């Protein structure tokens, strides 16, 4: 499913990610945005034999099972599957212990290159919340 | 193994752009994927400076450093250092890496 921006902000607001760790709702609506393009079904393999997952790009080394990516954690205990469903509730609940993991949301690549430090509010702006 | 130029203590945003060594053990370990986050201390009760891992922008060979890598190893880190905001979760400083040492494994 491709969400659309106040869509996917809905539904973020709704899972509790305003604010969550400190990050307003921008922030998570930014880092979809240029992480998967707000497509739940984004898939994108890495040179390492890794592979990320959904709205989030979660990666399979860690926090998902794929079955293919060795030194697998899979600390979310959840198959990398789960992440691509219509239903953003496995990825919101992922991100948040990603999210808790000490370092923010520093763990989203993206997010730091095209998100943090800029006025992230502006992907809510307008939207009925 | 390079000669330690600063404490983890000492790595401040003044040192934006300047080459710096750290040395001490590994605090802690996070990996996200194309973001590897290595931080570490040289002092109980001190700072732990972030060590940051980005694909495409880090040497891909310390990648495989990082891989055997483990909580309490001892290293010797030499990299450059970028300023940022402090927040919760922003010590307002962070290290990229060109060279990355293992010393001792815990």
Not at chain 2, 15 to 23: D, N, Q
Not at chain 2, 86 to 99: A, Q
Request: proline fraction near 3%; charge should be positive; include cysteine.
């Amino acid at each position: 499913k491709v969400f659309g921006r106040c869509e996917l902000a809905a539904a973020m607001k709704r899972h509790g990610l305003d604010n969550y760790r400190g990050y307003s709702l921008g922030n998570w609506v930014c880092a979809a945005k240029f992480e998967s393009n707000f497509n739940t079904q984004a898939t994108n393999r890495n040179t390492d034999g890794s592979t990320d997952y959904g709205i989030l790009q979660i990666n399979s080394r860690w926090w998902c099972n794929d079955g293919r990516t060795p030194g697998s954690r899979n600390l979310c205990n959840i198959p990398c599957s789960a992440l691509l469903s219509s239903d953003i509730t496995a990825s919101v609940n992922c991100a948040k212990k990603i999210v808790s993991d000490g370092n923010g949301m520093n763990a989203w690549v993206a997010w730091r290159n095209r998100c943090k430090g800029t006025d992230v509010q502006a992907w809510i702006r307008g939207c009925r919340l | 193994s390079p000669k330690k130029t600063h404490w983890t203590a000492e790595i401040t945003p003044n040192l934006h752009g300047s080459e710096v060594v750290v040395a001490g053990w590994v605090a802690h370990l996070g990996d996200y994927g194309r973001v590897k986050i290595v931080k570490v201390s040289d002092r109980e009760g001190g700072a732990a400076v972030p060590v940051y891992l980005e694909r495409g922008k880090t040497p891909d060979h310390l990648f495989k450093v990082f891989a055997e890598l483990s909580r309490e190893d001892v290293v010797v880190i030499k990299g450059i250092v970028e300023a940022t905001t402090v927040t919760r979760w922003d010590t307002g400083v962070e290290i990229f890496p060109s060279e990355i040492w293992i010393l001792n494994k815990a």
